[PDB]
Each structure stands twice: as C-alpha cells, then as structure tokens.
Design a protein around this ligand. Structure first.
Ligand SMILES: [Zn+2]
Lengths: 101, 43
RNA sequence: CGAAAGGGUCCUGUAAGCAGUAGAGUAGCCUUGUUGUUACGAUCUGCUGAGGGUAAGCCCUCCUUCGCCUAGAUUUC
RNA sequence: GAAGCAGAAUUCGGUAAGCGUUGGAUUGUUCACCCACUAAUAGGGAACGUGAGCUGGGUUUAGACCGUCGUGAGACAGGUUAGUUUUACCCUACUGAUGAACUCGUCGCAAUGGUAAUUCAGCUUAGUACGAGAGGAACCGCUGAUUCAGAUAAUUGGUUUUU
RNA sequence: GGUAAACGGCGGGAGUAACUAUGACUCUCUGUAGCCAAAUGGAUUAACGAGAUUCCCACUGUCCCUAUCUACUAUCUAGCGAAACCACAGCCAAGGGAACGGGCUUGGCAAAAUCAGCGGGGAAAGA
RNA sequence: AGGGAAGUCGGCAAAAUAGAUCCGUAACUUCGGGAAAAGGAUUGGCUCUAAGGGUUGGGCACGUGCGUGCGGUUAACAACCAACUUAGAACUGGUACGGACAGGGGGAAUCUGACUGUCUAAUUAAAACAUAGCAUUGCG
RNA sequence: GGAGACGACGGCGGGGGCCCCGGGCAGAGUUCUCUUUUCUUCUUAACGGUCUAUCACCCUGGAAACAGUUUGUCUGGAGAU
RNA sequence: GAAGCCAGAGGAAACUCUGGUGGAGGCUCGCAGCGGUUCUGACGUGCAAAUCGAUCGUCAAAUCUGAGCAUGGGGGCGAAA
C-alpha cells in the first residue's frame, strides 16, 4: 500500500537513493549532513528512532523494532548486500576509466 | 508542542500541530476557559 | 502501380522448450550418509539484446517473388 | 517649451490614442480600500436616458422561525434559512467551404479591403561630462529579456486503441 | 365578595394629621481565586444530523495554461421522416418633433444557386 | 511536467482515504459514549514448523455370549479416522503485493434541533411536525 | 376437556434437499509435451409394514465432602444423581 | 458488546480488581428493498405531462408491502405541508 500512488514519481515525492544510504552506512559524517538538512522537532519521535537502511524515522523504539521484522526492511538489506549502482560501476560497464597520470 | 503531543493534534508523520493548538488556546483564553483577570489599581 | 518478402531503422525487454553438483526445505529407498541417492520445489543460470512488433501518415530494394496496364462512362467556344 | 533644471531624479505645460495599462488580500459589507510587481498599473462610452449569453448581491411566490407592531387573520424597523424556464434546424449578420455561365489549363498583374509590433535591462561610452562632497548621465556601437504576433516539432516534457 | 393572579401593571424604605379602599403630605436611598449551600454551583448541555458558517493538514487540471486519447453524436450515404413558428419580408448609415423604424428622404452600395458552423440581432419563455 | 486553491461568491467538481492484522488514541461527557478519534508498523509467491479433534478397546475366580464376588486408575497406551483456522521461520520476484474488483479523507470550532422518526406526489427535507418528559383544565 | 388456534427476535441441536470429496463400471472430450486425466448417468413418489429417534412421565432409592448439567446456570427431600 | 452467569485474586462482610461467557439496543458500517441529498449532471416539441446516471438517507424498526374492509365534498383524512 503506497499513499497517493498517482504522484509517486513526482520530484517533490522523491525518496533517498540507495547509494546515498550506502554512504550513510559507511560514513557517519554524511548521515550527519543529511540529518542537518532536517528539523528534529518536526521529525517522528523527535528524530530519536531512525533506520539508516530504509532512511526512515519512526515514532517509537517498538515501532522501529517491529519495522525491522518486515519485508521492506529485508528488501533494503538485500539490495544493500548486492550493492548500489554507482558511477564507477557505470564506467566499468562500458569499459571506461579515469586517467589521473 | 507538549500540548499537541498530549492531545494528539498531529500532522502527517506525527509532527505537532502548533497552529491548531495555538488557535485552541486562544479560543480557551477568550471564552472563559482559562482563568485570568486584570487586578484593580490600589488606592 | 499494387500485394508479399528481404534488409534497415525504431519499440519492448530476454520467447517456447530443454538442461544444470544453483535452489529454503520436505518425504521416500538403501551404502544410513561420506554433493548418500531419488522425487517435488517459488525462484536462479545457460542456450537468448533473445522472441515479438515495425506504417497503418518510417526508409531502401530494375539486379527477391506474384499480379495489374494503352480502359469504361459523361461532357466540351 | 519652461523652472536653481549642476549631474542624477524630477515639477508644470504642449503635440500626440501608434502601443500598453498586471496580480493578489479583505463580504463582521454602501466591498471600497491596502500590499506588491511594473514603463505604467489613466479615465470613460458602446447597458445603467427600462429591458433573453453564463453566473453572484438590490431581491422579494409557496415551507420555517427570531425581533417589532396587532385582540386576530396578518403586516413589517428588521434579521436568518431553503427554494423549476428548459431555443435555434429559420432569415440576416459573422467565420470558414463549394460553385453555373466565358474551351481546358499553366504563368502572372494588382484595383480594393486588411495590416504589427512593443517595452525594459545589461556591456561600452564611463566612475567620464557635471560636482565641495555624496554621487552621477547621454548620442553612436553591441547583447539579452517583457508583452504581442506568425510559424515549427531536431531536442526535452505531456498524451497512448501502436491495445 | 375571593382569584389561574393568566394577561397586565409595577424604583424602593420609613412614617404620620387622613384612619377602609384610592390614601394625601414630609423624610432619604448609591480570592491570582472567597464564602455559603446536598461532589456540584451548570444553558460555555454530551450524543446524534444529506441542517447553516469559519479555518487547518492531506489532496489535486480550480487554474497558471492549456495539450492529448477513447466511445457515442455531430458529418456523408441508403431507407424513413415531424414540430414550433410564419401580415409581407429580411445589408447598412444619417434624417424621419410625439426620444420608434425594416418599408419613407438622402447616401454607402449591390451578381446565380449553395454546405458546415455560429449565437450580434429579427424570431424564440405553456412570458 | 513545475507550482499546489494563486481559481471561484464559495475547494463546486475532481484528487486524495478506504479491506484486514498489530501498536496506539485527546478534550469533552448525561459515564453509556466520543472512537474506525488522531498518529503509526505491515500485507505477494514458495517450502516448512507448531498448536487447536473424533471413534473403539482393560485383569482374575465361579455359574454359563450374559450374571455375581473381587481387583486397578500411567489407556499418561495403542489402532483407525477427520477438517478448517491460528501462530512462527527460512527462501524468493518486485516499478506495484486488499496488484482488477471492492472500499471512511481527517482535524479545530460556532450556530442550531435532544435523539430514532415524519411532510409540501411534480421547484422548499428544514431551527418545520411528531416524540418521551413536564405543567394546567374539565368530568364520579 | 382437548384439537382447530396463532407474536417478534437470538443462538444451539436433529432431519430432507442442494453444494463439496474419494473409489468403481460405462460413455465423451484433451493428448507437441503432461495429465491412472477433465466432464456426463449412477434415481426411487404417494401410500403402508416394521425397528428406532430430544422433551416428558413411571419404578427402586434417599443426596453436604452438595450433585447433575447447557455455547448460554438452570434443576433436585414438592425426591436429584 | 447492556443485564444475567463461571473462574481466579483480595476484602470481616458488603463489595473491589482481572480473565472469560452471554447477546441487549426505536445502536452502528453496509447488500436487496424503501426513500430522494447533491450535481453550472443527462434530458428540455423527452424513453417519461417528473424519466435517466453518479452521489446520498435508512436498512430488525415509529421498517417495507398485497388483498379484504371502513371514513365522502357544508365532508373525510392529516407525526399539520
Ligand atoms: Zn529499515
């Protein structure tokens, strides 16, 4: 069940990308900038309960724990284990490379 | 924000509705639901 | 000129079928486990940028086929 | 054209209607005023010297409350709510489309009718003229943009019965 | 004579000399959350509603600013086939004292027969 | 597309919501309600696991398949039969998993009639009417 | 004296019919591959006989350590089990 | 998810709490039916002298409905328009 499926693909309804989520998992600084672009008082649960893999805020720790048992979270985990598509892999697909000397 | 989270006046994602809660508080102040008065000047 | 066909150009997204020491697990037969084995089993992989469509207002084709043709009727200082 | 009009920005006046003259807020209300953008947000007529395009207020058939008046039926100083008109195929006008007569056709002329562009900004002039200072132009030249108009589909978006 | 004291009238409180109704004649009147009541001190009444109104979030072709697609029409053909309405008719301009012209005066002008639309008049509202 | 009521007298119309499981749910209140308030997490396919039932059936000693006199409650065991729910786990596709269909938008308030109900067939469905409750009058 | 002869609603139990499942004979369809497959017939009236079927009623007996018992707490010294 | 009922935990008892059970209501979502709110709806010499679509109210009762019968114009009937 997706809320308002007609306008899911609009730019104003865009969700966070998987490579950005991978960078959030690798480096806490990048996650810190992403959380700086938000306001904690408007966040669900005052921004205390956050799943990095789903890039999602939850209203309580019980809600976050219950979300971890669902298949969307496991689908995100499987996608992250397979790896996110990046510009470097796009380069390697066509056999291009960067020459820095 | 505390009044909004207590009374369940939440927007989408649980964001507190400070606008509606402020309107409720103003109406309660105006319509004799919160006690207040101007003390008289002393002679 | 027409109808097909072939080639190109686009659109989709990898056909049917077969196979596989891929497949969570379950049940049998015996060497009672040593891919033990056989059976089933979403899915995965290979054959396979494959299959399908392509002018209906896409392109090319004397030199890829088959067919059509010097009419009929009406009228005019 | 005139003004202590230095410059810049203006003020008053003249010819001029070619070309524009905008979003928006507010219905406890004579809806008129506020805010902004802008070059500017000028004023009128063709209705209102009664009057069938669409649709809101003056506004008012029948239902109903509340107030005022009345013995009452009811009326009103009033306030509120809900409430049936429903063409076009005719003639003219207008927009387009054919066409007899002159053999058919090709290439032309042009009477007459219509007519179209508009405004701002930036670079240079130039930190120059002018000026105590603060500030601060213009002509020629160049490049964009606003509004309007006429086309077009290479590209990008939208549209999918290519079912 | 007594009132449903209903309608209605009705600023109070003292007095007197009247002595009963009607009196009449003077005087003068301005707790930042308490106390008291059988927890509460309420109508600022819950629930309910195709009742009337204002606002918020979501939402979006209501616009901005329009574009495109499908079906059925409209269109063309075969067959079939009405009605409303109709003094006569239908291009305008100025004038036509009675604030009205389509017909008159003076001008502009003006060329067969037709089709799709259109909604300015003219017609059209059981007007 | 981008913006999101800038439209309009007025969000009219449309869009958004919607099934089910689970977490959670305020003021007010006639204590019954409000309430599906609000606000959240999930849902496909496959392969398994677990739980929830029914029927039948006891050893001796005498008379002879029944009568006694006993003896025992581990049948807590065997045999056979049967159906639909519920919970848990792995694996797997994905732009969608109540995949069509079906299917509440929600909230803050004000006025108003208590509520359910009824009427102007063919312009008005309502603060109109009725209602239970309350009060008065007449009659032995 | 009985029958004729009697409200609305709720769940529970019995029976018929329908629906569903398995086997068998016969027939039909499918059959590149698969499918001991998918589908169709397989019935039994009124009227009678016989054996049975909740409630209730009868006999024995006398119940507290109360018992029996429905999904739903009713029954019993006015005699239960 | 109202009374009634069972169990457990307390309480001297009355009662209190917890988990079940039960199935009340001019209760509620909603199909048929009944009704008729809204829409610049369709239709406007119509399919129709009141019809059509979507939407909406109600849906176990003051619900819907047939036949028989009764009330007749100075009248009747009227949850009253
Ligand atoms: Zn997660």
């Amino acid at each position: 069940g997706v809320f308002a499926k007609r306008t899911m693909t609009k730019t104003r309804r865009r969700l966070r990308d998987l490579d950005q989520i991978e960078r959030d998992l690798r480096s806490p600084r990048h996650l810190q900038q992403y959380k700086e672009t938000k306001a904690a008082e408007d966040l669900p649960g005052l921004g205390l309960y956050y799943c990095i893999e789903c890039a999602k805020w939850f209203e309580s720790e019980t809600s976050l724990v219950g979300h971890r048992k669902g298949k969307p979270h496991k689908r995100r985990l499987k996608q992250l284990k397979e790896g996110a598509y990046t510009h470097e892999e796009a380069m390697a697909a066509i056999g291009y490379r960067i020459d820095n000397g | 924000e505390m009044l909004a989270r207590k009374s369940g006046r939440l927007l989408k994602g649980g964001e507190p509705d400070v606008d509606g809660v402020a309107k409720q508080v103003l109406n309660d102040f105006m319509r004799g639901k919160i006690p207040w008065f101007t003390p008289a000047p002393e002679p």
